């Protein structure tokens, strides 16, 4: 530890973690960003919130944390608390619960060239406007917008990460370790870097890294528990045309009791449909249609 402690003491002499690393004026600190999704926890439609477990890989370089390994016994890496180094204050801008920041402030890994690696994990609840027209056969386009809270484009250059020759323009997902969400399947997972050309350069949050999640709902629960029973119970009402039109035929009993069952189904779906008002959900349209059909059968 003597070489590690020596290096830490020599590195932390006069180091201000609240001052951006710039060796010359008009220097822009390049920050490369990658996002790994470990599990899509949920999408609550009534709060319009996507809850996700992510690991954010941030890489930048700090000239003040440079050292030569030969002066420290061949030490080639150092684990430093993330509070003691300068950090790009990257936050999820579109958060719905007020949590802008990462869940755990782990150690950074400083290299002899001064290049800092940081992989904090985070629980994020992000705002996802739910398009309800085809519910429960819908797909959603959720967004995760990452930007610096304090620094501008003349101070940090926030870009997507580069692996060997190729830019990672997607959310990374472990093929082996990923467990699919029980109600949502990820079809597309791109990433983009957006910078409005006419935006003020001195303002902080204009260079954004946006990760998109296009997710398709698996509707099997609604098919099994709601849609097919409702279809069957509504099709029962068609049978009254074969009952006799006399006392004991029981046409009206059958039709109106089918309507009562449909009202019970209205109560069942009432606790599950989103409560926005741009569009009528597909399930609500179908239940209204089945109701009207039963009304016409009774008439």
């Amino acid at each position: 530890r003597n070489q590690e402690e020596r290096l830490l003491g020599d590195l932390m002499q006069g180091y201000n973690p609240h001052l951006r690393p710039a060796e010359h004026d008009s220097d822009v600190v390049n920050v490369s960003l990658k996002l790994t999704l470990t599990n899509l926890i949920s999408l609550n439609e009534r709060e319009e919130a996507l809850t996700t477990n992510v690991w954010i890989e941030m890489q930048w370089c700090d000239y003040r944390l440079r050292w030569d390994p030969r002066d420290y016994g061949g030490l080639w890496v150092l684990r430093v608390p993330s509070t003691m180094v300068w950090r790009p204050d990257i936050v999820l801008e579109n958060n719905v619960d007020g949590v802008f920041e990462v869940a755990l402030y782990c150690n950074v890994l400083v290299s002899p060239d001064g290049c800092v690696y940081w992989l904090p994990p985070a629980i994020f609840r992000s705002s996802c406007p739910v398009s309800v027209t085809f519910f429960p056969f819908d797909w959603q386009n959720c967004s995760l917008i990452f930007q610096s809270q304090t620094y501008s484009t003349n101070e940090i250059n926030l870009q997507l990460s580069q692996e060997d020759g190729q830019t990672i323009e997607w959310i990374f997902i472990d093929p082996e370790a990923f467990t699919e969400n029980g109600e949502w399947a990820i079809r597309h997972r791109p990433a983009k870097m957006l910078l409005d050309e006419a935006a003020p350069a001195e303002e902080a949050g204009h260079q954004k890294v946006v990760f998109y999640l296009l997710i398709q709902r698996k509707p099997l629960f609604y098919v099994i528990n709601i849609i097919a029973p409702c279809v069957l119970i509504s099709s029962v009402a068609i049978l009254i045309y074969f009952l006799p039109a006399k006392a004991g035929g029981q046409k009206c009993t059958v039709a109106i009791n089918v309507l009562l069952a449909q009202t019970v189904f209205l109560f069942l779906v009432a606790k599950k449909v989103p409560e926005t008002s741009q569009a009528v959900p597909l399930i609500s349209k179908y239940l209204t249609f089945l109701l009207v059909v039963t009304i016409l059968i009774v008439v």
Binding site: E169, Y241, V293
Partner: protein, 48 residues
């Protein structure tokens, strides 16, 4: 009344089947687009 029942049975069955098929096919054709961004030919997956 019997012949009236037989006519209106076919009418109501046609209505029920047509509405059911319309709703189910609007459900069936709502697929995610083949590309993440319309007007952009790229697919944004890691090449192998």
């Amino acid at each position: 009344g019997r012949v009236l029942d037989r006519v209106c049975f076919l009418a109501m069955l046609s209505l029920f089947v047509c509405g059911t098929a319309g709703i189910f096919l609007m459900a069936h054709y709502n697929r995610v687009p083949a590309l993440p961004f319309p007007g952009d030919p790229r697919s944004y997956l890691p090449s192998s």
